[PDB]
Amino acid sequence: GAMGSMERASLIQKAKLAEQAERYEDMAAFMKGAVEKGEELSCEERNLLSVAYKNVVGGQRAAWRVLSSIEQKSNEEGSEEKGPEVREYREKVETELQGVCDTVLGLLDSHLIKEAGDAESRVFYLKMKGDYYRYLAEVATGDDKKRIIDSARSAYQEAMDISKKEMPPTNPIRLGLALNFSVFHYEIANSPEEAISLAKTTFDEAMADLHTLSEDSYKDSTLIMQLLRDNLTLWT
């Protein structure tokens, strides 16, 4: 596409500059261009890709939630019918969000996942696949809502199976995957008990593996562990 003429290393460089500048749409476009060069991504490059799109779709989600809440109140008993505008603009944001999710899912399917053989890349990408189907599910209503939910579940489950076989319990990717799959259970799949069980088991098994880590590996790990605890406190 429009990044086809730019060197891979230059795209990576500019993705890092965009991050520093909090220009996440640009970041995402640079990283999409880098993925489309066809080479596998390194560990640091995978993080650039995920950060970029997480921040883009995060903003879209926050806006969608604002508009959906306005829309719902606008459809209460005793609310003045204020016309089609709120629905229209919610739909506009929704379609843009879906477009970004489809773009990410397309990068993962062409051809990041199929070429990822090491656990740390394969689980990373399958977690992203679950995440972006989850974001599609957050806005889904039609005939394919259940299929979108199952697509998210299936990606998360494959990631979970690999992570438990191939990674230590304190691995940050394993921990973040469990965090998000637990949220998927609570918020998407109407399975709060599974969400709580997964978060607690994950936390406890990570606690018992901390003793093997250096001081630095004891960081993003206890960081994500605190998010698991935060969620458990919200949920119980």
Binding site: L179, N180, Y186, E187, D230
Partner: peptide, 5 residues
């Protein structure tokens, strides 16, 4: 909302 990473 609950926390995700």
């Amino acid at each position: 909302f609950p926390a995700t990473v």
